[PDB]
Design a protein around this ligand. Sequence first.
Ligand SMILES: [Cl-]
Lengths: 125, 125, 125, 125
Amino acid sequence: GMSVKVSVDDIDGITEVLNVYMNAAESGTGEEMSAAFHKDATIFGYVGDKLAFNGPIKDLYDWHNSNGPAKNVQSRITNIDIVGTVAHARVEAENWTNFKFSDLFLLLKLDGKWTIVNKVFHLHA
Amino acid sequence: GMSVKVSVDDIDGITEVLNVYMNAAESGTGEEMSAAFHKDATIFGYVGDKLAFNGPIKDLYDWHNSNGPAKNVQSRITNIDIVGTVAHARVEAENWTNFKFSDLFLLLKLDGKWTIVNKVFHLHA
Amino acid sequence: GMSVKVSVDDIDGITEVLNVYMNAAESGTGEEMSAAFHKDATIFGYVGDKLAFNGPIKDLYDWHNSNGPAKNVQSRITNIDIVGTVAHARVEAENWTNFKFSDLFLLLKLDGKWTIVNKVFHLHA
Amino acid sequence: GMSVKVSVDDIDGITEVLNVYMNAAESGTGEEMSAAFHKDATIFGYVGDKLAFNGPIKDLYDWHNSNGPAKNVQSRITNIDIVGTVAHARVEAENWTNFKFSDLFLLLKLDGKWTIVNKVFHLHA
Ligand SMILES: [Cl-]
């Protein structure tokens, strides 16, 4: 039986995968960014009043490749809520190519290794 | 651009959709439960060592139909983190047909109405 | 020692004491409001540039007596983070005599029953 | 008029002060730890059945001088919830002289400088 007692181990595991994403946002490609995600991960988010992202995580990688690396981006984790095999995380990004993002994540501990399965975001006005 | 200031309106909209899910859990069918979810919603979760839920939200509605309503279930919302057009939410369920769940949700304000796009859970040992 | 696994029982206990605060805010006196707080509870908060609340919880009850009940107030619990014998909780208030507050709480399970020990708030501009 | 839009600036100020605490907990004295706390900060917490910490923050600095620095402690921020002038934050400590803590904080932007005004903790069994 597994304990849900929050450990520094799990905090670090989640932080690590989150860093994989934050580091690809700054310096990497959509293929490098996909290393932080489950093969069937999803993403939802509005660009204006258009739902530019409506499920397929492939749209995030393709977008990151067109828009390019955000050399000046500043990303911070602000919440890691862990319970056994799943978790929630929040990341705030600023100057992601002049964009300000609030990212919400759901993560799964897939075979002992944490990975992002879901992502939603809000573009700030 | 939608303001990210947290409003009582938004809190009640999210509570309202989570009530659809929680009430369906106790007294409803999987079809009634699906009223709280996006058409392309997902669900990930472990039962033992098997990843019984690996994306398709259909697996949720099918399992709720087979397992039937949890008449003795007690569920509570413990967190609602809102930011404009998306949100996170946590729900604790007990005696869901003798099960204990921690649910993590990602929500989207689709066309002015809140709906669950993602769900992960932990089954307590 | 006590387990930190989150239970519906504790959730309800905290909700209940937070109810004592939200109901007194709307209808009760400062003396009725203090029933939700430890004897040595505190409160910090700015009104403009002045730190009108800088420790003594006495000041909360006195202000709620002069200002009087907020009949039109809508208050909601949005977060309850529980870890064994202590917890954090957030509450959003609107039209508290025309004010809009965000409340952050620390609570203590004192002798098996939850009570608020710390309070801080932000008056929305 | 202040905005409550969560900024990387405030996330960095809160991380700053919290680091002064974590660092003093590892390598510093009680007076160095005091640098991260308001003059009238509080601390509640149980050691067994006894409420060893029942308000005075003086007690924390006294106990850290007696107990000495936890050279082996691994500490991690897990939550920064910010709203204007106040905030909540959580920190997980392990091997704090063999102790495991969960720290729930309430902070205040006292004259533009974040500082910890409240602390509660749970000592894991
Ligand atoms: Cl994005």
